Amino acid sequence: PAMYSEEARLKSFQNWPDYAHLTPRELASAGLYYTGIGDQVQCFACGGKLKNWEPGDRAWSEHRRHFPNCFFVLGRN
Amino acid sequence: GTIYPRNPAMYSEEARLKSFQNWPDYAHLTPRELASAGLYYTGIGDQVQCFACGGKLKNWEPGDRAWSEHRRHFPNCFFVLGR
Ligand SMILES: [Zn+2]
Ligand SMILES: [Zn+2]
């Protein structure tokens, strides 16, 4: 329940690496929080994990691409 | 990509189906059902593994379905969530 809050997902992004190609805000808004390693993030609703973000990737697009049956993704759509 | 299968070669359902060549005769689930749910035989007992999430399942019981057990134990699997 700690990660339901978009604000609490932001706070997980302490130690988010400076190289990473997306921001804590964008990720948190798409339901994702930092797992604490690399540039890996996880969804608070489906638990799906995403990493190795590339320049130009968007948080929502990848989240919906790989975890289409996530309830949060299904509502966003 | 932003996701990555635990076992790329078992990416293929056909490759997964072939892994059941020596599936034991006591194991009641069919290779067809298991492979369709992303699972391939590890070669040990009745233990299968998902090519996507890498989760393992074994000690199957009557009325167990492959997809149901896969989703129950590994609900955040991209194969489960892409189905
Ligand atoms: Zn999700
Ligand atoms: Zn899986």
Numbering used by the authors:
A (entry chain C): 158 to 234
B (entry chain A): 151 to 233
Can you list sentences taken from the study reporting this PDB entry?
XIAP (X-linked inhibitor of apoptosis) directly inhibits the upstream caspase-9 and the downstream caspase-3 and caspase-7, and therefore controls critical apoptotic checkpoints. The XIAP protein consists of several domains, including three zinc-containing BIR (baculovirus IAP repeat) domains (BIR1, BIR2 and BIR3) and a C-terminal RING domain. The linker region blocks the active sites of these caspases, while the N-terminal regions of the partially processed caspase-3 and caspase-7 bind the BIR2 domain in a peptide-binding groove that accommodates the four N-­terminal residues. As has been reported previously for other BIR domains, the overall architecture of the BIR2 domain is a three-stranded antiparallel β-sheet surrounded by five α-helices, with a structurally important zinc residue coordinated by Cys200, Cys203, His220 and Cys227.
We have successfully determined the crystal structure of the BIR2 domain of XIAP in its apo form. We have succeeded in producing such crystals using a construct that spans residues 152–236 of XIAP (cutting off the linker region) and includes the same two cysteine mutations, C202A and C213G, as were incorporated into the construct used for NMR studies, presumably for improved behavior in solution. XIAP BIR2(152–236;C202A,C213G) crystallizes as a dimer, with the N-­terminus of molecule A occupying the Smac binding site of molecule B. However, this binding does not mimic the binding mode observed in the Smac, caspase or peptide complexes; rather, it is likely to be the key to driving the crystallization of the protein. In the apo structure, the binding site of molecule A is unoccupied (although glycerol from the cryoprotectant is sometimes observed in the P1 pocket) and is available for the soaking in of peptides or small-molecule inhibitors. Furthermore, one of the glycerol molecules that was observed in our initial apo structure overlays well with these serine residues. His223 in the apo structure was modelled so that the δ-NH can donate a hydrogen bond to the backbone of Glu219. On the other hand, the rest of the protein, including the peptide-binding site, of caspase-3-bound XIAP BIR2 and our apo structure is very similar. Furthermore, these crystals diffract to better than 1.5 Å resolution. We have successfully crystallized and solved the structure of XIAP BIR2 by itself for the first time and we have shown how this system can be used to soak peptides into the AVPI peptide-binding groove.
